[PDB]
């Protein structure tokens, strides 16, 4: 029953995606995946997605956590694809099985929100994501409105929708 992918001609790309404009730090501030929104858990810590613009353009990407412990810095590379706002992963050997990643700036208005688009194959099963992202950890009932909306118009409903609670630790960095 695991929510198939919708076809990537349904998924907008942003429009004259500017790679500068849209570098530093995004608060993960929603989020819909087809696998889940687990089910036996309370709601999720936000974190804080860091996009550096290399010289080779492509991204150095910064995911940063709160756990228990401590803060963590989880990196990887968002290399670009065919067009502008769109990205594969460098490292994609490093995962066991994946023989695919890529990544979709759906819209943005670079200074306040984004939506992105992920999606993976590994050993032939698929995954895909949707992130609502802010510069600020708080946002309109406007813009989760439009998130939730957008969701479900790629075929997933409210209980695949999260909104993680803000925190200071780590992700204020
Ligand atoms: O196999 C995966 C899954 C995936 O490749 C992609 C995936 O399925 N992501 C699911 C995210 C669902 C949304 N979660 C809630 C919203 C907040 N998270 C994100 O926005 C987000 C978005 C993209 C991500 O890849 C990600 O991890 C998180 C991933 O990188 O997470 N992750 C483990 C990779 C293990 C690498 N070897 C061990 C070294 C330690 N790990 C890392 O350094 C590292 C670095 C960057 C990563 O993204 C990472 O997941 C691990
Ligand atoms: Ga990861």
Same mark, same amino acid.
């Given at each position: 029953?695991?929510?198939?992918?919708?076809?990537?001609?349904?998924?907008?790309?942003?429009?004259?995606?500017?790679?500068?404009?849209?570098?530093?730090?995004?608060?993960?501030?929603?989020?819909?995946?087809?696998?889940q929104? &687990?089910?036996?858990?309370?709601? #999720?810590?936000?974190?804080?997605?860091?996009?550096? /613009?290399? +010289?080779? @353009? $492509?991204y150095?990407?910064?995911?940063?956590?709160?756990?228990?412990?401590?803060?963590?810095? &989880?990196?990887?590379?968002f290399? #670009?694809?065919?067009?502008?706002?769109?990205?594969? /992963?460098? +490292?994609? @050997? $490093?995962?066991?099985?994946?023989?695919?990643?890529?990544?979709?700036?759906?819209?943005?208005?670079?200074?306040?929100?984004?939506?992105?688009?992920?999606?993976?194959?590994?050993?032939n099963?698929?995954?895909?994501?949707?992130?609502?992202?802010?510069?600020?950890?708080?946002?309109?009932?406007?813009?989760?409105?439009?998130?939730?909306?957008?969701?479900?118009?790629?075929?997933?409903?409210?209980n695949?929708?999260?909104?993680?609670?803000?925190?200071?630790?780590?992700?204020?960095?």
């Amino acid at each position: 029953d695991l929510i198939p992918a919708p076809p990537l001609s349904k998924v907008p790309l942003q429009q004259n995606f500017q790679d500068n404009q849209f570098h530093g730090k995004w608060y993960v501030v929603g989020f819909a995946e087809n696998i889940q929104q &687990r089910e036996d858990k309370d709601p #999720p810590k936000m974190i804080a997605t860091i996009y550096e /613009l290399k +010289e080779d @353009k $492509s991204y150095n990407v910064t995911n940063v956590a709160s756990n228990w412990e401590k803060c963590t810095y &989880r990196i990887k590379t968002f290399v #670009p694809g065919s067009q502008p706002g769109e990205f594969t /992963l460098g +490292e994609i @050997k $490093s995962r066991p099985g994946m023989t695919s990643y890529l990544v979709r700036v759906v819209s943005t208005n670079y200074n306040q929100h984004a939506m992105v688009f992920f999606k993976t194959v590994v050993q032939n099963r698929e995954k895909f994501w949707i992130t609502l992202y802010g510069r600020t950890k708080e946002l309109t009932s406007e813009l989760k409105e439009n998130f939730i909306r957008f969701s479900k118009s790629l075929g997933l409903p409210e209980n695949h929708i999260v909104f993680p609670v803000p925190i200071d630790q780590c992700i204020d960095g």
